[PDB]
Amino acid sequence: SMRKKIFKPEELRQALMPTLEALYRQDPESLPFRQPVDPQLLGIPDYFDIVKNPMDLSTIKRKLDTGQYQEPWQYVDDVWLMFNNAWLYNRKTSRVYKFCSKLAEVFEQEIDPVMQSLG
Numbered sequence: 797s798m799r800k801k802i803f804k805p806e807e808l809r810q811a812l813m814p815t816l817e818a819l820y821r822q823d824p825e826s827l828p829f830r831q832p833v834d835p836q837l838l839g840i841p842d843y844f845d846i847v848k849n850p851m852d853l854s855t856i857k858r859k860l861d862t863g864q865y866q867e868p869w870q871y872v873d874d875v876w877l878m879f880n881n882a883w884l885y886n887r888k889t890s891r892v893y894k895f896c897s898k899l900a901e902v903f904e905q906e907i908d909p910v911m912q913s914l915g
């Protein structure tokens with residue numbers, strides 16, 4: 797009975813893109829997240845056993861760019877999935893885990909006022 801899909805996908809693309817862009821701008825911290833994790837290249841054959849739903853910046857970019865997000869929270873859910881996969885798979889002491897945490901912090905700071913602009 798509630799209202800759904802009040803925003804056009806293209807309005808969400810415009811509103812949210814800056815938050816994606818801020819993650820891309822993080823150097824070196826975005827580098828492990830730019831492309832899908834390739835278990836064969838990284839020599840981690842258990843990756844897809846542990847991470848059942850992979851997500852990365854390129855995939856999010858392409859969904860946002862092509863209007864695949866129909867609700868703002870669907871984009872946020874994908875960013876969080878990317879982070880949560882990285883924190884699940886990687887050791888807490890690891891370079892990639894620390895980089896995840898830095899991206900997560902940048903994202904939090906970026907997304908809160910944007911989601912208020914959608915209020």
Ligand SMILES: CCC(=O)N1CCc2[nH]nc(-c3ccccc3)c2C1
Pocket residue numbers: 827828829833838881882885886892
């Ligand atoms: C968030 C990415 C992830 O979980 N990876 C698994 C462990 C890992 N180690 N090194 C990387 C990596 C570093 C730079 C560029 C691409 C991947 C990755 C990617």
